[PDB]
């Protein structure tokens, strides 16, 4: 293809340029929150972020080489994880706060406004504190997010589709080389490079865990009709089948 021919610097460059914009919330003058008021803002935000995520995914090296079917499956599996790692990343320099949008900065006590969401907030905040203590770089962030897109759904793909999974894994190794390249350039020793790599990837295990919990919560809010969900959002939720 072309993603395999990219060097480590071109990978970083491609990922940084592919970065989606930071959307604003339609929040406020009307003053404080209700359970329905906050859920509305969060779901409205997520829906608009989904549109940009899809165009971002198509700018991820090697993604457009895949079939339309595989692209759908990968995004269906990983869309909430991608939203979470993004939220966590931009909330890094705001300890104890979640920066959903530049005009929507929430603390965990505001997570109590919605039934059973403070538990999810706590998991997101702890992940953000983790990235902050690791001094996570933007170049490392874009690599991790791309890894989530390609990896989270690859396990749930007999035909010549073996060519598809092999391609996804070649690109994954490329992003790994890129992550290591960044750390080597950061002056980290070989032992430190491998350790930091392991640390970053194990966090993706927790991010997967948060997505599964979030998907269940969003499903419970969907069934009681507290909040109106967009058709696009409902479909992404439907792909996980409860």
């Amino acid at each position: 293809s072309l993603a395999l021919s990219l060097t480590a610097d071109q990978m970083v460059s491609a990922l940084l340029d592919a970065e989606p914009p930071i959307l604003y919330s339609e929040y406020d003058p009307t003053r404080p929150f209700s359970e329905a008021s906050m859920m509305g803002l969060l779901t409205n935000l997520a829906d608009r972020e989904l549109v940009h995520m899809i165009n971002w995914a198509k700018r991820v090296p090697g993604f457009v080489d895949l079939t339309l079917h595989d692209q759908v499956h990968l995004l269906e599996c990983a869309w909430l994880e991608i939203l979470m790692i993004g939220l966590v990343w931009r909330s890094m320099e705001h300890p104890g706060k979640l920066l959903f949008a530049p005009n929507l900065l929430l603390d965990r006590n505001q997570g109590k406004c919605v039934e059973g969401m403070v538990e999810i907030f706590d998991m997101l905040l702890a992940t953000s504190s983790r990235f902050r203590m690791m001094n996570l770089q933007g170049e490392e962030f874009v690599c991790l997010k791309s890894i989530i897109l390609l990896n989270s759904g690859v396990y749930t793909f007999t035909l010549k589709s073996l060519e598809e999974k092999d391609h996804i894994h070649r690109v994954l190794d490329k992003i790994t080389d890129t992550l290591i390249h960044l750390m080597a350039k950061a002056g980290l020793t070989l032992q430190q490079q491998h350790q930091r790599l392991a640390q970053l990837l194990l966090i993706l295990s927790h991010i997967r865990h948060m997505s599964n919990k979030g998907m269940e919560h969003l499903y419970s809010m969907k069934c009681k009709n507290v909040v109106p969900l967009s058709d696009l959002l409902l479909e992404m939720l439907d792909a996980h089948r409860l």
């Binding site: 692209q71 269906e76 479909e235």
Partner: peptide
Amino acid sequence: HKILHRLLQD
């Protein structure tokens, strides 16, 4: 036919 299908094709 899915919305995600349409958005991936633009």
